[PDB]
Amino acid sequence: QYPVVDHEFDAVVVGAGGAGLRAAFGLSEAGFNTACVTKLFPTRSHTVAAQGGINAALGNMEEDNWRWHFYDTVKGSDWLGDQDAIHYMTEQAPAAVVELENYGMPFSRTEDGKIYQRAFGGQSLKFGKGGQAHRCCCVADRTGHSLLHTLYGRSLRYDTSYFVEYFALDLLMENGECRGVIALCIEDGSIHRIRAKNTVVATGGYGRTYFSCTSAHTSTGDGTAMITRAGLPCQDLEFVQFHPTGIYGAGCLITEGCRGEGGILINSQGERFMERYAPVAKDLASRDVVSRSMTLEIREGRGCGPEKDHVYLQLHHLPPEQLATRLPGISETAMIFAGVDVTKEPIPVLPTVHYNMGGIPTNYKGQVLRHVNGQDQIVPGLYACGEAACASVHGANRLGANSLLDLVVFGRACALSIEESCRPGDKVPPIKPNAGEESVMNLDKLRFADGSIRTSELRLSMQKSMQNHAAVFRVGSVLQEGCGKISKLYGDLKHLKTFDRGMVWNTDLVETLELQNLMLCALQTIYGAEARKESRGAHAREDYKVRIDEYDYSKPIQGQQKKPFEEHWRKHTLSYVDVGTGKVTLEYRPVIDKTLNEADCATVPPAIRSY
Amino acid sequence: LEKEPLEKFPDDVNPVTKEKGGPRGPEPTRYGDWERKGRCIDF
Numbered sequence: 173q174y175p176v177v178d179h180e181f182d183a184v185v186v187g188a189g190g191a192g193l194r195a196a197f198g199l200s201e202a203g204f205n206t207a208c209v210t211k212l213f214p215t216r217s218h219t220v221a222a223q224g225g226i227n228a229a230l231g232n233m234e235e236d237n238w239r240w241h242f243y244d245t246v247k248g249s250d251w252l253g254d255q256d257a258i259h260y261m262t263e264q265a266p267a268a269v270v271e272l273e274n275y276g277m278p279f280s281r282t283e284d285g286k287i288y289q290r291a292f293g294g295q296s297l298k299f300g301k302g303g304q305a306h307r308c309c310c311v312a313d314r315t316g317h318s319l320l321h322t323l324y325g326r327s328l329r330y331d332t333s334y335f336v337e338y339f340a341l342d343l344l345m346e347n348g349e350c351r352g353v354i355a356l357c358i359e360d361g362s363i364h365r366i367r368a369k370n371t372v373v374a375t376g377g378y379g380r381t382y383f384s385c386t387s388a389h390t391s392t393g394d395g396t397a398m399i400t401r402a403g404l405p406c407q408d409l410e411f412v413q414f415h416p417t418g419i420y421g422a423g424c425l426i427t428e429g430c431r432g433e434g435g436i437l438i439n440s441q442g443e444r445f446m447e448r449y450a451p452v453a454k455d456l457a458s459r460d461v462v463s464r465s466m467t468l469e470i471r472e473g474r475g476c477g478p479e480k481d482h483v484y485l486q487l488h489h490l491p492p493e494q495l496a497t498r499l500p501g502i503s504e505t506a507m508i509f510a511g512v513d514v515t516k517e518p519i520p521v522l523p524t525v526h527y528n529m530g531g532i533p534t535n536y537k538g539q540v541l542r543h544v545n546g547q548d549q550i551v552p553g554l555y556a557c558g559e560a561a562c563a564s565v566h567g568a569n570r571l572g573a574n575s576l577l578d579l580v581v582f583g584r585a586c587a588l589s590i591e592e593s594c595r596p597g598d599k600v601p602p603i604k605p606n607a608g609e610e611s612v613m614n615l616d617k618l619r620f621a622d623g624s625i626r627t628s629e630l631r632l633s634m635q636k637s638m639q640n641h642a643a644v645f646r647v648g649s650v651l652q653e654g655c656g657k658i659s660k661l662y663g664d665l666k667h668l669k670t671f672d673r674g675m676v677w678n679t680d681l682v683e684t685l686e687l688q689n690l691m692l693c694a695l696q697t698i699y700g701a702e703a704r705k706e707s708r709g710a711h712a713r714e715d716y717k718v719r720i721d722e723y724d725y726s727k728p729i730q731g732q733q734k735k736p737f738e739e740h741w742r743k744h745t746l747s748y749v750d751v752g753t754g755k756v757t758l759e760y761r762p763v764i765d766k767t768l769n770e771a772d773c774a775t776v777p778p779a780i781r782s783y
Numbered sequence: 784l785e786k787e788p789l790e791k792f793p794d795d796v797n798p799v800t801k802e803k804g805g806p807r808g809p810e811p812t813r814y815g816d817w818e819r820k821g822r823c824i825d826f
């Protein structure tokens with residue numbers, strides 16, 4: 173028996189990053205008795221690392237129009253984005269940024285006192301025909317840090333109840349509705365059932381399914397996994413955004429400016445291999461081409477290092493004065509993250525996960541969806557927002573500076589939806605006396621696991637397998653091999669050994685729970701990728717190089733046979749796992765093309781991808 | 784920014800663009816991504 177403590181709130185938010193804080197602040201400000209459950213201290217959430225921008229069509233540097241931001245986001249999504257959610261996000265963005273300013277975020281300003289804005293992410297004016305937009309806003313060099321401190325701080329006067337260093341284990345589902353969350357107090361080992369009328373899942377990404385990612389070790393897909401364990405679908409988990417040049421062993425990305433200033437990529441044979449794949453553009457080829465090229469170098473046996481699993485970015489041929497003046501700080505960064513002296517040695521680099529477009533499917537109000545007999549349906553009492561969700565505003569490819577925006581827009585949307593449908597003090601639904609018992613049983617099994625495989629060994633094997641089979645280079649045979657490997661590793665979960673049997677601050681146990689969650693995410697990612705026989709956005713297949721829509725949008729629509737839903741790929745992947753057996757099931761649901769108001773913002777029909 | 788810190792501007796006003804309270808040192812977007820000390824923050 174475990175000490176089990178019951179709590180009752182109006183609402184519970186799982187996560188204290190930008191999305192969860194925006195939802196919890198909103199609910200508390202509106203008078204809801206709100207709990208925020210977070211495994212990390214709030215200001216240590218990954219959002220704190222987001223030093224850059226947030227897009228909003230304020231029109232401070234030139235004429236702008238949020239409908240032009242809508243267009244950029246739809247096109248960037250490669251027509252897997254849901255245009256109703258994209259309409260919502262882009263139309264709300266100017267108000268969201270001004271709200272944040274009013275709450276105390278000190279966005280930088282022009283001489284005339286307006287929020288200063290930058291061009292970024294390939295954004296455009298006039299539906300792609302107007303040249304570059306300037307709609308990216310920031311705070312000093314610390315936008316995400318300012319966002320977390322602003323929202324966390326402002327919530328305190330409204331008495332949000334923070335459960336810090338609590339690990340959410342599962343949703344409290346009853347008869348198809350969510351009634352709260354069951355969580356582990358990591359400090360003392362007690363089990364807490366936090367009942368609420370509405371639950372918001374804002375748990376961030378799952379980058380740690382891969383060997384190289386830009387998030388810390390705590391980005392383990394825990395909210396995704398809770399959804400899977402409830403028998404609910406995850407969505408589009410195969411759509412993972414990579415960057416070509418992350419530092420090996422660190423995951424820290426380095427700027428394309430390293431190559432713009434003259435740095436070059438080298439393989440184990442000392443060759444400047446981009447001259448082979450991009451004879452004109454060389455190391456300044458597009459990110460997709462560089463990522464693919466680096467991956468082929470490693471696959472074909474030309475990787476560097478003891479494990480031949482990375483390549484080199486060479487800067488030591490540039491005069492040190494240039495490095496110091498044109499790339500100030502690169503020396504410090506290379507030393508800190510790679511122990512490399514860039515005047516003497518190359519920086520080891522490999523393609524690195526940065527963002528998870530996929531996640532928990534929602535509508536534009538943040539309501540979590542199930543999909544039954546071809547019909548989308550909301551799950552009563554359950555919401556999701558931020559990187560953990562799939563609204564889907566990013567579809568097959570997130571635009572730069574749209575990810576901080578999605579946090580605030582959809583965290584706010586979840587709070588607004590709850591406020592519109594409920595009142596503080598509404599009766600909180602009851603839960604059965606043994607609600608959550610399966611979560612406690614699992615925890616106890618891991619706590620006393622005495623198999624033969626260390627958690628860290630199984631995790632590394634999964635991460636390497638994902639990196640080698642489900643990353644930038646995707647082809648059937650390799651994906652199929654990877655699927656078999658991930659399924660075998662899933663079976664190895666039953667053979668884990670843990671070392672700490674105690675109840676106080678048992679982080680060994682937490683890391684094992686996180687591994688279970690990572691493995692569920694990895695299974696769904698790789699099986700979804702294997703099934704999707706097309707190329708779209710971040711998912712590029714060597715054997716299916718074309719985007720497969722309901723029409724051939726490279727040709728005039730007049731006179732084409734429209735393909736049946738089951739015969740094209742312009743549809744979201746829905747994935748499910750039987751957690752006991754590891755059996756993966758895939759279904760599909762349509763992309764939402766309709767906007768919230770066609771007169772205000774026209775649906776953008778699919779168009780050929782421009783490169 | 785310990786060993787190679789980004790240049791802080793007088794009154795936090797960029798002398799070129801007159802931006803107040805924005806990114807220090809060179810323009811972070813000058814290579815098309817968002818760079819700080821050679822790290823790519825976003826793209």
Ligand SMILES: *Cc1cc2c(cc1C)nc1c(=O)[nH]c(=O)nc-1n2C[C@H](O)[C@H](O)[C@H](O)COP(=O)(O)OP(=O)(O)OC[C@H]1O[C@@H](n2cnc3c(N)ncnc32)[C@H](O)[C@@H]1O
Pocket residue numbers: 186187188189190191192209210211212213214217218219220221222223224225226316338339340341374375376377386387391394395526527557558559560572573574575576577579817824825
């Ligand atoms: C990695 C990254 C991303 C990033 C960026 C720089 C880096 C290094 N720069 C960006 C930028 O300049 N502009 C932008 O638009 N996006 C940028 N990104 C992406 C963006 O920062 C992230 O997508 C975003 O911050 C994600 O926010 P979200 O609120 O969704 O998630 P989070 O900050 O990771 O917080 C997750 C919270 O969930 C809690 N959690 C997780 N699991 C549990 C469990 N099991 N139980 C309880 N709580 C849980 C965490 O504690 C955390 O609070």
Ligand code: NA
Pocket residue numbers: 186187188189190191192193374375376558
């Ligand atoms: Na969050």
Ligand code: NA
Pocket residue numbers: 528529530531532558559560561562
């Ligand atoms: Na996502």
